[PDB]
Every structure is written in C-alpha cells, then in structure tokens.
Amino acid sequence: DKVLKIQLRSASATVPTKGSATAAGYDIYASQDITIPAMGQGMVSTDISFTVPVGTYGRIAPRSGLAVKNGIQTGAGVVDRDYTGEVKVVLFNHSQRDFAIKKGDRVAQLILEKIVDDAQIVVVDSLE
Amino acid sequence: DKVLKIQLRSASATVPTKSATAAGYDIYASQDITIPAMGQGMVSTDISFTVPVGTYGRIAPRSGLAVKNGIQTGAGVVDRDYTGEVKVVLFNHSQRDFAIKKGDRVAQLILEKIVDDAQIVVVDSLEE
Amino acid sequence: DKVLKIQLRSASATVPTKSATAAGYDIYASQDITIPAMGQGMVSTDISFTVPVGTYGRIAPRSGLAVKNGIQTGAGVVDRDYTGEVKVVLFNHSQRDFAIKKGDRVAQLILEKIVDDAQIVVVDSL
Ligand SMILES: [Cl-]
Ligand SMILES: [Cl-]
Ligand code: NA
Ligand code: NA
C-alpha cells in the first residue's frame, strides 16, 4: 500500500533521507560532482532507482534554500511508478552564478504525490 | 466518479493517452508553434476537460523535453471547474528555439489528489 | 472535516481565499517588491500556516501571471510542521520587471495529498 524501494546502483549513491520527522520529502543526493551553469541547466547523477508506493508517482521537487540562494529550480521531475532506470536530477539555474555540486550534496527532494492513475477517459460533447 | 471527461474542440485535438501505471496522460499540440530560446510560448491543445472529484489537473513537464530541449511547464494548475481550452505554457530555458508541430506531445496531465475542501481557520499561534 | 490553520503575522497580511472546486487558496503579498527581468525575488506574505494531516502545502503559480509576466513559482514545498513566515519565491522569465504591491495576489496554495509516512526498503532489483 505504501513501501518506498530504493536500488543503489553504485557505492556513490546515498539512500534518500527525511530532514525532519514530518517533512514532505526525502532528500536526494548527488553521486558525482557537477556544475550547473548560470542561466543554464545540468543533469545531476544520483546512482539510484526507486519504485514509489501504489497510488503515487515520485515528484522530484526543489529544495527551498537552493531556490532562494542559488536560483535553483528542478526540471522534469515526474518519476512514474513503472520507471526503473537511474533517477537523475534536472536542475535549471536561474541565477548569474554557476552552481557547484559535490558528490554527497542534497540537490532536491523526493515527494510521493498521491494521484488518480486509473481514471476512465470519457469523451463528451460539452462540459458542465 | 473517477472519470476524466474530455471535450475535443477541433479535429486537430488528440484525446489524451496514458502504461496503466504511468502518472500522466499525454497532452498534444493542436497547432504549430515555436517556443523561443530563453523565452516562452502558449501551446494550443483544442481540448478542455473535467478532472475527477478530489483532484486537480496538473500540466506537468515531459522528462524527455526537459533534458533534450530545456523545456519546463508554466502555470499548470487546472481547476476541476475550468471548462475553457487547456493551453500549455512552456518556458524554453535552452539556447535553441523549440519547434512544435501539430500532433507533438508537449506535456503530461497528472490527476493530483488534493484536499479541496479544508476549512480556513485563523488562529493566534500555530505553535499554540 | 479537514482544517487549514492560518496565522496572520501582521495587519498587512491577507487570509488566503478560495469557489469550492478550485484547487488552490490565493496567496497575497503583504509588502511591495519588484521581481527583476530574468531574475527572482522573495515576496513577503506575513502569514504562516499548518496544512491538514496527509498533505504538504504547495506554493503554485497563478496562470494569468505566468502568461503575462513570465512568472513561475520557485521552492514551494511547505512542510506541515513549518511555522515560519511563508515567503513566495518568484522567477521572472520575461524581459519586463514585475511590480508587486501589498495586497496583490501572487501565487496559490494547494493542499497536495502525499504519502508522508512511507518506509524505505533497499533492494538489489526493482
Ligand atoms: Cl544572480
Ligand atoms: Cl543549449
Ligand atoms: Na490512485
Ligand atoms: Na504565481
């Protein structure tokens, strides 16, 4: 009903952690150093895979401090429950300053967003 | 009641499609458009829809376009009572204009579960 | 009955507003601020809130501002346990500075349902 499975794909990967007991997400960590160019984008390696619980998808959502201080926003971010490859992190840098990331830094958070994933499509002439 | 209602405004629209376990339904451009490099545009879809009770319709980014073309969705909160055309706002963070053709996939629709009837109460102290 | 508890930290603050089938609650600036072209800024709201059990508060964009001002919301993950002032991170992707006056609607709060009590298992194979 709600188990979060992690595959650690190299020794460089870190298991996602909660920052508080009641935090929405799990911190996601870089497994390789990378720079996110100013007004640019990059893709951060994590060397992890996961299966989110039934009735969810995994949202790769931004860390607030990196937003406020470094101009960091996450891109992409919809991890399907069926998805089984390495979860990498798209970052946009909306600042004037390159953003240096080291192996071991928290770069994003994972939120298990509850969804309706079994809707019946009904095509209709008009809406209410 | 977990029915997604779809209204097609043109033979140029495509009914959204979903993998039974994917989080999202594909959203297709109904008309050509280029998103300028370091800029934005609004993609026509010629569809309207009503999401299931208990959700809203989140217009979320396609992962491929994020990585390949620096494309992020903007706006993207579709209320359950919205009956107009769902137009897709796209930011292009890359250095290349992103050319979109009719029938191209440009976003995905996630039926996000929400609390949409919380009572708003004003209190002295959250801490209490 | 589920409850969103709001604290008005000053007389400049506005209780958020929500139609019954709308997804979000409007969030208002409590102070003037300009968001620079191709830049970002932090909007003061002078409110704090506690979202219902099973949710976090997502600070999400207004659609009309996205379209006409290039405004995207940044950060926006407000944990249920957060009791500080909720400031709104705005990215301006347009070539015009965006002017915000106290009392302007700048964002929306959605009470996103989530699994906040999942247990991590580690596997060789997904
Ligand atoms: Cl800067
Ligand atoms: Cl580029
Ligand atoms: Na579901
Ligand atoms: Na906004």
Curated annotation (Swiss-Prot), chain A:
Molecular functions per Gene Ontology: dITP diphosphatase activity; dUTP diphosphatase activity; magnesium ion binding
GO cellular component: cytoplasm; nucleus
Keyword Glycoprotein tagged: no
Outcome after substituting residue 63 to A: Exhibits very low activity
Outcome reported for the amino acid change (mutating residue 83 to A): Exhibits reduced activity and lower substrate affinity
pH effects: Optimum pH is 7.0-9.0.
Pathway: Pyrimidine metabolism; dUMP biosynthesis; dUMP from dCTP (dUTP route): step 2/2
Pfam families according to UniProt: dUTPase
Outcome of substituting residue 106 to A: Exhibits reduced activity and lower substrate affinity
GO biological process: dITP catabolic process; dUMP biosynthetic process; dUTP catabolic process; pyrimidine deoxyribonucleoside triphosphate catabolic process
InterPro entries with a match to the protein in the record: dUTPase, dUTPase-like, dUTPase-like_sf, dUTPase_trimeric
Gene3D superfamilies linked to this entry: 2.70.40.10
Keywords from the named record: Hydrolase, Magnesium, Metal-binding, Nucleotide metabolism
E.C. code: 3.6.1.23
Binding site for dUMP: 64, 77, 80, 83, 88
Entry keyword Transcription: no
Entry cofactors: Mg(2+)
Reactions that this protein is recorded to catalyse: dUTP + H2O = dUMP + diphosphate + H(+)
Disruption phenotype: Leads to dTMP auxotrophy.
Family in the record: Belongs to the dUTPase family.
UniProt xrefs under NCBIfam families: dut, PRK00601.1
Assembly and oligomerization: Homotrimer.
Protein purpose: Involved in nucleotide metabolism via production of dUMP, the immediate precursor of thymidine nucleotides, and decreases the intracellular concentration of dUTP so that uracil cannot be incorporated into DNA. Shows a significant activity against dITP, another potentially mutagenic nucleotide.
PANTHER family linked: DEOXYURIDINE 5'-TRIPHOSPHATE NUCLEOTIDOHYDROLASE
Protein name from the UniProt record: Deoxyuridine 5'-triphosphate nucleotidohydrolase
Species, as recorded: Saccharomyces cerevisiae (strain ATCC 204508 / S288c)
Gene it is expressed from: DUT1
